[PDB]
Design a protein around this ligand. Structure first.
Ligand code: Y24
Ligand code: QQP
Length: 177
């Protein structure tokens, strides 16, 4: 079957991001043309990660999300043996060289509180959550980045939810997380 979600995801997100998302979904055994809300979510999580890496220095962040499983773990191993940090139990999204810590990025359609707390159970790796309605929540209220960088990310999330709304896809997306 041919989605409206799939076609919208394709002409909304950047072709490289769509491809990286199709690769990750297929690696975990899922179909972008079947579970299309997950398709949109993966693209969003990716793009937010990339803007995050963009705000800041020239190369302050090492990008872990996007890479293939094996290579991502390789890079975190090299970081851990370089900075002396505990090899996380689960793959993070980035590493801050300035603050010497792995960052887990979060993008949720629930309360920033419940998604944080649920993710917080999954220990020195920073957590940072964003939301489609413009809210964010981060560990020790250390939001790592400039106010403008985070503002731009929030604006993007909101325009995405607007673009889904006018296509009547927003509600189906929301009642799925
Ligand atoms: C470096 C490239 C691709 C890079 C993805 C993005 C490009 C995006 C990000 C900007 N943004 C922000 C808004 C949404 C978006 O896409 N783009 C698109 C427009 C121009 C640009 O830079 N990055 C980030 C770092 C520099 C870069 O190239 N990856 C993929 C995962 C790891 C990684 O580093 N690698 C790495 C090895 C294989 C490969 O191919
Ligand atoms: N069963 C699986 N489904 C998708 N991905 C799987 C995966 N198993 C392994 N991975 C890859 C490792 N995942 C991450 O690193 C990571 N996962 C998420 C997340 C988690 C659950 C449901 C949806 C999401 C997402 F937000 F992407 F859509 N959010 C993040 O921010 C993040 O960094």
């Amino acid at each position: 079957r041919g989605s409206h979600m799939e076609d919208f995801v394709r002409q909304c997100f950047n072709p490289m991001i769509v491809e990286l998302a199709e690769k990750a979904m297929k690696e975990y055994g899922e179909d972008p043309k079947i579970e299309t809300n997950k398709f949109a979510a993966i693209c969003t999580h990716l793009e937010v990660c990339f803007m995050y890496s963009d705000g800041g220095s020239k190369h302050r962040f090492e990008i872990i999300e996007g890479r293939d499983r094996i290579m991502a773990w390789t890079v975190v191993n090299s970081i851990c043996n370089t900075t002396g940090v505990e090899k996380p139990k689960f793959l993070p999204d980035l590493y801050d060289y300035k603050e010497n810590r792995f960052i887990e990025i979060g993008v949720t359609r629930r309360e920033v509180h419940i998604y944080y707390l649920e993710k917080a159970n999954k220990e020195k790796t920073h957590i940072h959550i964003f939301s489609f309605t413009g809210e964010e929540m981060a560990t020790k209220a250390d939001y790592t980045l400039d106010e403008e960088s985070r503002a731009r990310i929030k604006t993007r999330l909101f325009t995405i939810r607007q673009e889904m709304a006018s296509r009547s896809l927003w509600d189906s997306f929301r009642q799925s997380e």
